[PDB]
Design a protein around this ligand. Structure first.
Ligand SMILES: CCCCCCCCCCCCCC(=O)O[C@H](COC(=O)CCCCCCCCCC)COP(=O)(O)OCC[N+](C)(C)C
Ligand SMILES: CCCCCCCCCCCCCC(=O)O[C@H](COC(=O)CCCCCCCCCC)COP(=O)(O)OCC[N+](C)(C)C
Ligand SMILES: CCCCCCCCCCCCCC(=O)O[C@H](COC(=O)CCCCCCCCCC)COP(=O)(O)OCC[N+](C)(C)C
Ligand SMILES: CCCCCCCCCCCCCC(=O)O[C@H](COC(=O)CCCCCCCCCC)COP(=O)(O)OCC[N+](C)(C)C
Ligand SMILES: CCCCCCCCCCCCCC(=O)O[C@H](COC(=O)CCCCCCCCCC)COP(=O)(O)OCC[N+](C)(C)C
Ligand SMILES: *[C@@H]1O[C@H](CO)[C@@H](O[C@@H]2O[C@H](CO)[C@@H](O[C@@H]3O[C@H](CO)[C@@H](O)[C@H](O)[C@@H]3O)[C@H](O)[C@H]2NC(C)=O)[C@H](O)[C@H]1NC(C)=O
Lengths: 589, 108, 34, 57, 126, 43
């Protein structure tokens, strides 16, 4: 009997993992079979530019690499300014497919398909993390949610190659290895938790949260009085191995010593050291131990991203809270602290969903444990059990339909191609500039498009999206705002050959360079106040417009003349509409 | 008060040391791992200089972390944890004491 | 491949993974101590 | 079981020699491959020694 | 004596903590930073709302959370503090559980109706 | 500068003390472990 039931459980779990490793893979791929397969955005085109350097010379020439094609008069030093770990596991997968398994594939296809392949590891790790709080019947359910829910599809679709894909998995594996060594007491699990903490401190820059979430667990675990000899051995080896492993990565070199964020962990370690001695004295006396001892989010984004998991999320913490079995304080302490920070930032919704899934997959398991546990035959009881279990299975199917509706509508679109017809005029003029220009030639554009010009047109820009030296962007914005006769000289001191301007007045692009022209002025007022002032680009009685009654120093600027050059001679009769500002331009303006 | 707890703790500790010949070996290792850290900081306080700061921090980390793994072995070796024998605490001490020396030879 | 077939493949894998959970939890709830 | 103890000292001393030889001038992948080829038989042998000796620890 | 029973009981920490998650998952914080006005909620826009609408959200989410926790660790207490003296009391459990399920369905339908008023072209209500 | 082209920890003569405070803990550790499995319990 026991062999039959155990074999049934094993085979059924194998078929479950074969399905739920496949539903994720098939959900991520709308932008790859709809369009071509290319990297999506601004920030993932530096990472692809760095894992294509590592992949066709050595690993020794990548850790200390000085590139002179960015921030041109003073190039940046990469090895002390980026996080390795997203590149080197990718060069490892490339080196393993090419030499051992037998099949050679390009580096671009390993970079595009790096998130959907990797999400199944997050599904398995959430299974194993839920297997410790509750029995293994709820781990399949929590593993069934997190491969579907669209607050996490938004950041890893096929094409995104940013840091959070590896990060939201290593977060889960580190919490699993800590929650094993909170209960058992052994040293070796805290060592393995220290090593995945080292592999998570190097891929991702919000490692500060996992550093300030463990001493809050121990510090809430002492004030209740549940101190034991399990905490002296599980905490201090995590801190001893994990801290000095954290200092090995440059760009976080001596920062866990001087910095304020890591102070709480150090203080807790000292506090733990004191209380371990104050427990030995208690075993001797009985009487005198009394004498000694960012943008806020709106409301419907939360229902939009999770369907009914946000609905029974504050029931799972209550039902979780009526037990207190010494590892539920981890989830109860995670939930409040993370839910406060995910209400004033937008982009900290990603650290919130692995507890909406777990605490929303505990309460529902405790509901299923009694209303389909029939074991007596009566009509009314089977009526109640049947209609309650039917009531919840209905919402769970509607959860599947909802999630795959909202993935293909909002979170699946490239920023490189702009759709009744196509508009592909943003890759003509990078490939012009790659084909028909000499190979050492500087391009001067505004800092939003720095990564794409270096990645896809292959030239040596002056600024990019890093905003590292902040009094260099003010030079470029001082050049695009002055009259022509001085911007010539300022641009000629730096040896600029080409300048380029985007413009959306013809089909209504909206994010053009006239709408971003105001912020440029403000960046150029923090230094040279006398030369440029934003009291002059406004008209009489303070209105900003581009019409025949514009300012006298707006009409003579260098970003006005370069956008509306042959625009009135285009349309019939000698008049034109701007299609965004909705204003009318005459060829004397 | 403190006289009674003092003499009680001295006697109840020294009998525990004289029972088991494993404990005085641990504590004899521990005390000289304190004196290493003390005079190694005394070199810093003696001449006011701070130049190879990582080479300062590596030996000090060796002293503190190596102290802590001994105290965890001592706590686990007197009273057994439920599920862990005494042959497995020692092997975990070997492995986790053997990672730490490598990451404090890379760091100097 | 048109994404209508990708759409039907997506909901098909969702329902086939989401139905077997319930019969796993029903066998594990009825014929087990806890 | 004295030959097993002889196979227990040599792997720990062997895991100190490759760290010193790492400190002098060698690169990473020689250290890591030498640590694998030394690493597995010392795992099997040392495990069987701690199992064999046993009760007097 | 009494304050130690207050600081020692875990029910007030339960209601305080769950009340904190409830009053902060309805975007209380957004209302506090960018002050707004206070007939009902602002239709057809996806990122703005008034100030009385978060009261309605707190009432909804708190109500169905209370229905679920009364459904799981509930029905024993009510019968005990109610009449036991009639008969085999399985029928009270049956109709009590069924009416709790139907109330869950009604308030969930109310929530989906309000979200279609906020942002239309949502392909399935109720 | 590269990460390999730096004066090493021999040549500074300000960090001889710390190298001497690594070698002692290594050899004291191996004499600890060899003198731990070759002893008795409450003889
Ligand atoms: C209990 C202790 C557990 C320890 C676990 C250790 C696991 C690490 C295993 C890594 C195996 C690397 C194998 C390898 O050599 O692949 C290389 C190099 O591939 C890489 O670039 C990635 C390897 C980088 C190693 C990172 C430092 C070591 C981190 C773990 C100690 C392919 O990269 P390539 O870019 O093709 O060239 C590298 C330079 N050559 C000299 C090889 C030409
Ligand atoms: C012996 C065991 C072997 C196990 C490992 C097998 C590896 C699975 C496949 C590896 C990745 C291949 C995906 C791929 O490169 O195809 C992409 C995009 O085409 C697609 O539609 C994507 C299909 C990917 C589905 C499977 C993803 C699974 C995640 C990695 C295993 C299209 O390539 P292209 O870039 O368009 O190349 C040009 C193709 N022409 C026909 C135009 C010439
Ligand atoms: C528990 C709750 C409170 C927590 C307190 C934790 C905060 C205090 C921690 C100790 C002091 C940390 C500050 C610190 O160390 O700053 C040092 C330089 O500062 C120094 O002067 C060195 C201080 C070292 C302490 C020496 C005396 C200690 C005596 C102990 C017995 C920075 O030196 P740097 O200039 O950054 O060295 C860099 C060298 N490079 C070659 C890399 C460029
Ligand atoms: C799957 C891939 C996993 C990705 C993890 C992230 C990998 C990148 C992190 C590396 C951070 C930069 C470190 C660095 O710059 O140094 C590297 C040394 O490179 C290293 O090996 C870093 C080792 C860091 C400590 C490892 C602790 C783990 C414990 C292993 C038992 C260069 O080593 P080398 O210069 O090649 O070796 C010569 C060193 N001498 C001392 C002999 C001179
Ligand atoms: C900042 C964001 C994170 C905040 C976390 C919010 C609070 C969540 C964790 C605490 C909630 C549970 C507290 C609790 O129930 O235990 C208190 C024991 O508690 C006390 O007696 C004093 C209260 C100390 C806990 C709260 C500390 C406040 C937060 C400090 C940063 C008393 O219950 P007990 O009865 O002691 O627990 C069972 C033990 N008996 C054997 C005695 C029955
Ligand atoms: C696109 O096609 C062209 C045409 O073949 C490729 O150009 C080749 O390479 C260089 C330019 O990169 C051409 O000019 C040469 O420049 C070198 C500078 O070192 C100079 O020494 C030579 O005397 C010559 O002027 C070259 O004529 C041309 N053809 C070859 C090598 O057969 C280009 O590489 C292609 N790819 C791109 C632009 O990505």
């Amino acid at each position: 009997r026991s062999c039959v039931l155990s074999v049934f459980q094993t085979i059924l779990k194998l078929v479950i993992f074969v399905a739920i490793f496949g539903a994720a893979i098939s959900s991520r791929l709308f932008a790859v079979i709809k369009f071509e397969s290319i990297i999506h955005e601004f920030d993932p085109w530096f990472n692809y530019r760095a894992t294509k350097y590592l992949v066709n010379n050595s690993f020794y020439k990548f850790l200390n690499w000085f590139d002179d094609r960015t921030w041109y008069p003073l190039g940046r030093v990469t090895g002390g300014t980026l996080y390795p770990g997203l590149m080197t596991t990718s060069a490892f997968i490339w080196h393993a497919l090419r030499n051992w398994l037998g099949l050679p594939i390009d580096i671009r296809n390993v970079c595009v398909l790096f998130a959907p392949l990797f999400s199944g590891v997050t599904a398995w790790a959430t299974y194993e993390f839920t297997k410790e709080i509750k029995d293994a019947s709820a781990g399949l359910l929590a593993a069934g949610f997190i491969a579907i829910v669209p607050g996490y599809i938004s950041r890893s679709v096929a094409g995104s190659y940013d840091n959070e894909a590896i990060a939201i998995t290593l977060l889960m594996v580190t919490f699993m290895f800590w929650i094993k060594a909170q209960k058992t007491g052994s040293i070796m699990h805290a060592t393995c938790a220290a090593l995945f903490y080292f592999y998570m401190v190097s891929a991702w820059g919000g490692y500060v949260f996992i550093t300030n979430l463990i001493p809050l667990h121990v510090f809430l675990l002492i004030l209740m009085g549940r101190y034991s000899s399990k905490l002296y051995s599980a905490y201090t080896t995590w801190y001893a191995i994990g801290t000095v492993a954290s200092m090995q990565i440059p760009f976080v070199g001596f920062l866990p010593i001087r910095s304020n964020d890591h102070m709480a962990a150090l203080g807790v370690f000292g506090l733990i050291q004191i209380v371990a001695f104050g427990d030995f004295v208690k075993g001797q006396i009985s009487t005198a131990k009394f004498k000694v001892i960012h943008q806020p989010v709106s409301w419907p984004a939360f229902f939009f991203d999770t369907h009914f998991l946000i609905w029974l999320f504050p029931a799972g913490v209550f039902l979780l809270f009526l037990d207190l079995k010494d590892e539920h304080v981890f989830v109860i302490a995670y939930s409040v602290l993370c839910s406060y920070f995910a209400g004033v930032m937008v982009r900290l919704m990603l650290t919130l969903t692995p507890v909406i899934c777990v605490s929303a997959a505990v309460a529902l398991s405790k509901i299923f444990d009694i209303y389909l546990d029939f074991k007596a035959i009566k009509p009314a009881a089977l009526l109640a059990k049947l209609i309650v279990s039917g009531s919840f299975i209905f919402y769970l199917y509607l959860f599947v339909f909802h999630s795959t509706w909202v993935t293909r509508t909002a979170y699946s679109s490239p920023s490189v191609v702009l759709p009744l017809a196509l508009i592909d005029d943003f890759r003509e003029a990078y490939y012009w500039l790659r084909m028909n220009s000499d190979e050492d030639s500087k391009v001067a554009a505004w800092w939003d498009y720095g990564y794409q010009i270096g990645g896809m047109a292959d030239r040596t820009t002056l600024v990019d999206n890093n905003t590292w030296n902040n009094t260099h962007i003010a030079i470029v914005g001082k050049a695009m705002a002055s009259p022509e006769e001085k911007s010539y000289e300022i641009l000629k001191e730096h040896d600029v050959d080409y300048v380029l301007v985007i413009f959306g007045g013809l089909i209504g692009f909206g994010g053009d360079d006239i709408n971003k022209f105001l912020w440029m002025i403000r960046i150029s007022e923090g230094i040279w106040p006398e030369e440029i002032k934003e009291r002059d680009f406004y008209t009489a009685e303070g209105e900003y417009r581009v019409d025949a009654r514009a300012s006298e120093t707006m009409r003579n600027s260098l970003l006005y003349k370069m956008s509306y050059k042959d625009f009135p001679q285009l349309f019939n009769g000698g008049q034109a509409t701007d299609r965004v500002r909705q204003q009318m331009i005459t060829p004397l303006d | 008060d403190f006289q009674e707890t003092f003499k009680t703790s001295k006697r109840a500790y020294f009998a525990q040391i004289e029972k088991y010949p494993k404990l005085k070996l641990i504590d004899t290792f521990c005390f000289f791992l304190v004196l290493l850290g003390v005079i190694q900081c005394t070199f810093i306080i003696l001449i006011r200089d701070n130049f190879p700061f990582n080479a300062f921090l590596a030996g000090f980390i060796i002293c503190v972390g190596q102290f802590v793994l001994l105290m965890s072995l001592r706590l686990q070796l007197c009273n057994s944890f439920p599920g862990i024998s005494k042959n497995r605490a020692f092997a975990e001490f070997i492995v986790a004491s053997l990672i730490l020396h490598f990451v404090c030879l890379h760091f100097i | 491949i048109s994404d209508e077939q990708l759409n039907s493949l997506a909901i098909t894998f969702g329902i086939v993974m989401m139905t077997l959970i319930v019969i796993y939890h029903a066998v594990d709830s009825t014929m087990s101590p806890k | 079981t004295a030959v097993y103890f002889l196979g227990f000292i040599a792997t720990i001393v062997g895991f100190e020699v490759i760290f010193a030889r790492y400190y002098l001038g060698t690169s990473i992948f020689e250290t890591l491959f030498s640590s694998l080829y030394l690493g597995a038989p010392g795992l099997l042998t040392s495990t069987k020694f701690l199992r064999s000796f046993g009760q007097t620890i | 004596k009494l304050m130690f029973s207050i600081i020692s009981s875990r029910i007030i920490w339960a209601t305080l903590s769950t009340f904190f998650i409830i009053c902060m998952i309805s975007a209380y914080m957004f209302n506090q930073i960018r002050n707004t006005q206070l007939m009902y909620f602002l239709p057809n826009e996806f990122q703005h709302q008034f100030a009385i609408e978060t009261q309605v959200m707190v009432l909804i989410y708190g109500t169905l959370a209370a229905l679920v926790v009364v459904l799981v660790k509930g029905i024993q207490f009510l019968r005990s503090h109610l009449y036991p003296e009639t008969k085999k009391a399985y029928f009270i459990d049956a109709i009590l559980a069924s009416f709790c399920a139907l109330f869950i369905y009604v308030f969930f339908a109310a929530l989906t109706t309000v979200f279609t008023i906020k942002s239309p072209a949502y392909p399935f209500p109720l | 500068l590269a990460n390999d082209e730096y004066p090493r920890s021999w040549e500074i003569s300000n960090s001889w003390v710390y190298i001497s405070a690594i070698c002692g803990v290594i050899v004291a550790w191996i004499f600890f472990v060899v003198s731990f499995v070759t002893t008795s319990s409450v003889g």
